[model samples]
Target: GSSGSSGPITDERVYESIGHYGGETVKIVRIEKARDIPLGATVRNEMDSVIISRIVKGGAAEKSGLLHEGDEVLEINGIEIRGKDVNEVFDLLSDMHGTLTFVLIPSSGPSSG
Candidate 1:
């Protein structure tokens, strides 16, 4: 995690607009660690929504500087994932290697262009 004293952020509204606009911000990350395990995170369904359940400590995602527990994953590898099944999301990650990009709505923060 980045150095700071603050706790996780919460801002659903920040992502609401991006979900439909397709103008959501993109984050590029490279996973150089652990190629066999899942992206060091758990994915689960909450109220019919797929979200990142937990991020493994010192894992590929933690090192990538993108992704968080609550960030809404809008797309994976340029493919929309909003309405996809949780298993489908994992499938994509399971097949992933090298560089990965995500179109996401962060848990909190001003939307980035």
Candidate 2:
């Protein structure tokens, strides 16, 4: 995906925090995650989070009629996710253990553009 930005950044370069995933940008936000989990039924999940991005037009989720943007994911196969990050969600998607069913809190928003 392409990030939109403009104008020049005028500031003195501070050499404080520096690492491989290192850099500073006042106009940019980065989210990183490290995964650690085994593929199993316990990890299977149904995505219920807001759909900020889409992969295809009328794809699996879209065709299902239950998936949509701004959907608050409640649980996967009755497993409640009170607290979890994107990485954890991804792991669950990857698992797809058995017939996974998820409850999503769909919002009244645009489906796609």
Number of the top lDDT candidate: 1
lDDT at residue 19 of model 1 (Cα atoms): 28
Candidate 2 lDDT over 15-61, as tens digits, reads 42222222422111111212422222122223533232332343334
Report how far off residue 37 is in candidate 2 (Å): 19
TM-score of each: 0.61, 0.42
lDDT of each: 0.66, 0.41
Q: For model 1, how does the per-residue alpha-carbon lDDT over 1-113 read when each residue is reduced to its tens digit?
A: 67865666565344322324544454444455345755777767766556777888766777775778887676666666878878888788777766666666566765788
Clashing pairs in 1: none
User: Which stretches of model 1 miss by more than 4 angstroms?
Assistant: 1-37, 109-113
- In angstroms, how far off is 54's CA in candidate 2? 3.8
Pairs of residues clashing in candidate 2:
48-73
